[PDB]
Design a protein around this ligand. Structure first.
Ligand SMILES: CN1C(=O)[C@@](CCC2CCCCC2)(c2ccccc2)N=C1N
Lengths: 615, 310
């Protein structure tokens, strides 16, 4: 369903008005805490000594009603950035008065307007209110998609509207939000209440709001069209924006009087509910945003990583093809192919290898190697109750285990967000000694990819991960497991590093260094880099989490995020240059990264001070 | 007290208008307390105001009143907070105030209204940035204009032209309108952008000149043909809320402000009279049709002061 509210700048009877909007079907109400025309004086006599009350009582609604049904509104006369010092000083005290009253009522959100370029003093008064007593209160900034100056009708004779293309000028409203958000030091309590106009701007303007903290979407009655029945509807372009906003789970707000007088306000809400009940169908991937790389791995953590039928059906086909290619029809019963499952886990690859041998109709001798003794319990119980003498469970590290015979095929996997998955090159290098001279490794190739991303929401989430007894900026020097739905990609992903198994080099060095140049054709703000990977199990049988070559049905593998301490402003035509290192000692493996264009950033995670994966 | 009239008048007085025969019209709004609604009042005796028990006619409107204007001798045009323009007509014996139409067309609060010279058409300015031309007989909107970029502060119809009118907003624009043009709006005023315009007043003798007040307390005289500001005076210390011309052959300009003071200026904008009787914001002013030296002013302090202008 649609979580929606009604916006009203006129409330004569607070009890009767709330009953009218609840009857219409609205969940909450955007109303003013003080009368919009009631201009108060605070310095000049005798208007400052005006007899009270200054507004209506808090007793008129119950505590639960103020906490869940009423969203505050700042009075329109309050202009803290006015050219007149008297209006400026009076608006400062009135803003504090209205913000403190909103906190006193315990309102879940408070609406403040961004209708001009300069809101520096409105930013100071709000930043001061937030730093005066901790609260769960939210602040929604009313920002339009198109400024009213660029929306006005061309009816002024000696002042015509600009018809020429102005790429940066069309994005000025985002600059109003960004400058205000920057001044307030990226407060977790300041969000966007995006106001949609009659005519939508170009795609790049709407795309600039991707990754921004949009918590509300304001829709005026003026933007609604009249269908061939007399009911309020929306254009196909306006409908496209509603589908995008519904996926972000924003609270839709209805503003303005009923222009469809022959109908009612309930029909405007019925059309939004009609859009959600008939929105595009979701996929298996669609059915906190960031989680760090897991190293504990419990029974349920192994279970959710095993919830990938597409991954093991590919592994089955990869082993099935390798068996027929290694042993012909004449050696069907006389030749036994020794298979070694390195990192056996709870037996998902083992069962897939057994299903492949029955499919290929070839003889196999299985060895199930696993370091985790908790997972070995599941393997040894599986072997005794189902597998038998065919599968030999080994409770040892693949790098230190002494095998009784050389292997024909070695099978390994990366499961979920396990931190030790990054050690795959070193783990397979210490296991290839007990592999035959003509032996095959499944997978045989791994190729990683990097892409520049923009997400002001994810940047503030990493920023909130500050911990005591460690560097206050350590959170930006470590990778995170994030969903593709959150961030906005700035350029096509490019190859970062490749690993081939078995490694034939006489002097194997798993250390890497690449310089990637990404062309950016939009005005944006860089917050970090997303990492994807492609794997070649056997010949044409592959698995990929890269957005272009993504395997349909995959759910266990999520992209990795490498954030940056300070976000970098990127212009149209500019190039993002990233420097990435994969570093490895004789004990630890870590990642290092830095930005060299358009502007320079500090090298992240030097010597792995914030993050390392122990071998 | 008359029937259907409210028991108590609302504290904040928004409008004061004198009818041709000398009847006083009052607009009251409750900008604080439990109820945030408005009320319309008629007083055949000017000295009887603000006493509720001794009024000719009274009624309570759905929401608060922001601006008023006489539509002849029986019609009353209301600028409501609900975003509606209301038309209330008087009784045969003028004892009741009955509603003719309540059309909700403006998305936000209707802050200003002005009836055109014909008396059959009226212009309305609202916080929704829009300006609407209304048909008082057909009860519908003729044209909807979105020429400004901020809330419309004041709309004033020309004294004797049905197509010409002035409109000012918080976007620092003073627009001279003429519906006879394909592009009706025309940006007029000072050369360099100064302080925001708050009040507009057409000259009753010279239909080509007008006066405007800003947010800093300055009143300026401007000719539409000359389009270059030459005469200006720092009248008040706070925002100029209203400006009203006297009915004299040589008109006097009554200046209103939030600094709780009333000022009377000549033609060269020089101070002739100044009253500090109001202890709160001075909202409206109207010169008496019988005695042209009498000026009635209202405020948010619930005071209906009568001044003697020399
Ligand atoms: C989701 N994810 C990645 O895309 C990847 C590549 C996996 C990596 C392949 C080679 C062998 C070891 C593992 C990465 C790491 C660094 C840069 C780009 C991508 N690691 C994680 N967790």
């Amino acid at each position: 369903r649609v979580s929606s509210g009604r916006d009203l700048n006129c409330v004569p009877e607070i009890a009767d008005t709330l009953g009218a909007v609840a009857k219409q079907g609205f969940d909450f109400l955007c109303m003013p805490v003080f009368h919009p025309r009631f201009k108060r004086e605070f310095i000049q006599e005798p208007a400052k000594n005006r007899p009270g009350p200054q507004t209506r009582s808090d007793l008129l609604l119950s505590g639960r009603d103020w906490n869940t049904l009423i969203v505050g509104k700042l009075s329109p006369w309050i202009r803290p950035d006015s050219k007149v010092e008297k209006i400026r000083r009076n608006s400062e005290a009135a803003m504090l008065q209205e913000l403190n009253f909103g906190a006193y009522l315990g309102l879940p959100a408070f609406l403040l307007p961004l209708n001009q370029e300069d809101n520096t003093n409105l930013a100071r008064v709000l930043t001061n209110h937030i730093h005066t007593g901790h609260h769960s209160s939210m602040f929604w900034m009313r920002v339009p998609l198109v400024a009213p100056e660029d929306l006005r009708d061309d009816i002024i004779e000696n002042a015509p509207t600009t018809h020429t293309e102005e790429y940066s000028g069309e994005e000025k409203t985002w600059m109003w939000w960004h400058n205000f958000r920057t001044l307030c030091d990226y407060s977790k309590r300041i969000a966007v209440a995006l106001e949609i106009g009659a005519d939508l701007p170009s795609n790049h303007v709407i795309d600039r709001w991707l990754g921004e903290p949009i918590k509300a979407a304001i829709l005026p009655t003026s933007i609604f069209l009249t269908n061939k029945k007399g009911f309020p509807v929306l254009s196909k372009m306006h409908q496209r924006l509603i589908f995008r906003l519904l996926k972000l789970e924003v609270q839709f707000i209805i503003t303005g009087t009923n222009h469809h007088s022959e109908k009612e306000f309930c029909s405007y809400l019925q059309y939004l509910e009609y859009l959600s009940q008939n929105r595009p169908p979701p996929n298996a991937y669609e059915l906190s945003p960031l989680q760090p790389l897991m190293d504990n791995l419990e029974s349920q953590t192994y279970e959710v990583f095993e919830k990938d039928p597409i991954k093991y059906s590919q592994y089955q086909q990869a082993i099935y093809k390798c068996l027929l290619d290694r042993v012909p029809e004449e050696e069907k019963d006389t030749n036994v192919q020794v298979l070694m499952v390195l990192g056996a886990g709870r037996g998902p690859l083992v069962n897939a290898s057994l299903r492949a041998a029955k499919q290929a109709d070839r003889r196999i001798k299985l060895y199930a190697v696993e370091k985790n003794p908790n997972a070995v319990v599941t393997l040894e119980n599986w072997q005794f109750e189902e597998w038998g003498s065919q599968v030999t469970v080994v409770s040892s590290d693949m790098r230190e285990w002494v095998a009784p015979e050389k292997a024909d095929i070695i099978v390994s996997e990366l499961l979920g967000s396990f931190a030790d998955n990054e050690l795959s090159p070193e783990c397979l290098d210490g296991a290839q000694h007990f592999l035959k001279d003509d032996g095959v490794s499944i997978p045989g190739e791994y190729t990683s990819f990097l892409a520049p991303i923009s997400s002001s929401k994810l940047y503030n989430e990493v920023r909130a991960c500050r911990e005591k007894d460690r560097d206050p900026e350590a959170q930006f020097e470590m990778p995170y497991v994030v969903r593709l739905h959150n961030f906005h990609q700035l350029s096509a992903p490019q190859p970062c590093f490749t690993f081939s198994h078995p490694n034939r080099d006489p002097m194997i060095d798993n250390n890497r260094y690449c310089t990637l140049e990404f062309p950016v054709e939009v005005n944006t703000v860089l917050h970090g880099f997303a990492g994807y990977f492609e794997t070649v199990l056997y010949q044409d049988i592959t698995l990929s989490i890269r957005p272009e070559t993504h395997s349909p049905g995959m759910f266990s593998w999520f992209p990795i995020l490498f954030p940056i301490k300070q976000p970098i402003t990127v212009r149209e035509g500019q190039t993002i240059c990233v420097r990435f290192w994969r570093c490895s000692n004789s004990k630890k493996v870590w990642y290092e990264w830095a930005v060299t264009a358009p502007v320079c950033s500090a090298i992240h995670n030097p010597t792995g001070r914030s993050y390392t994966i122990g071998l | 007290l008359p029937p259907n009239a409210p028991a108590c008048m609302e504290r904040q007085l928004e409008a004061a208008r004198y009818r041709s025969d000398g009847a006083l019209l009052l607009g009251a709004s409750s900008l604080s307390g439990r109820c945030w609604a408005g009320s319309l009042w008629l007083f055949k005796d000017p000295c009887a105001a603000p006493n509720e028990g001794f009024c000719s006619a009274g009624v309570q409107t759905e929401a608060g009143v922001a601006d008023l204007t006489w539509v002849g001798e029986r019609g009353i045009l209301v600028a409501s907070d609900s975003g509606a323009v209301e038309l209330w007509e008087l009784d045969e014996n003028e004892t009741l105030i009955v509603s003719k139409f309540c059309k909700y067309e403006h998305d936000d609060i209707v802050s200003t209204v002005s009836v055109l010279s014909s008396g059959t058409q009226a212009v309305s300015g609202s916080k929704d940035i829009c300006i609407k031309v209304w048909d008082l007989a057909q009860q519908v909107v003729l044209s909807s204009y979105r020429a400004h970029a901020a809330q419309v502060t004041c709309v004033a119809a020309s004294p004797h032209k049905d197509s010409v009118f002035l409109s000012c907003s918080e976007d620092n624009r003073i627009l001279l309108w003429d519906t006879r043009c394909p592009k009706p709006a025309s940006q007029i005023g000072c050369s360099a952008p100064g302080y925001l315009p708050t009040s507009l007043a057409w000259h009753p003798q010279q239909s080509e000149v007008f006066v405007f007040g800003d947010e800093n307390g300055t009143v300026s005289l401007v000719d539409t043909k000359s389009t270059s500001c030459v005469l200006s005076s720092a009248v008040h210390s706070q925002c100029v809320t209203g400006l009203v011309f006297s009915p004299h052959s040589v008109p006097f300009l009554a200046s209103l402000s939030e600094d709780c003071s009333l000022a009377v200026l000549d033609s060269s904008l020089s101070e002739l009279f100044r009253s500090q009787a109001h202890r709160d914001f001075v909202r409206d002013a109207t010169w008496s049709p019988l005695n042209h030296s009498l000026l009635t002013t209202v405020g948010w302090d619930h005071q209906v002061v009568h001044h003697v202008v020399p």
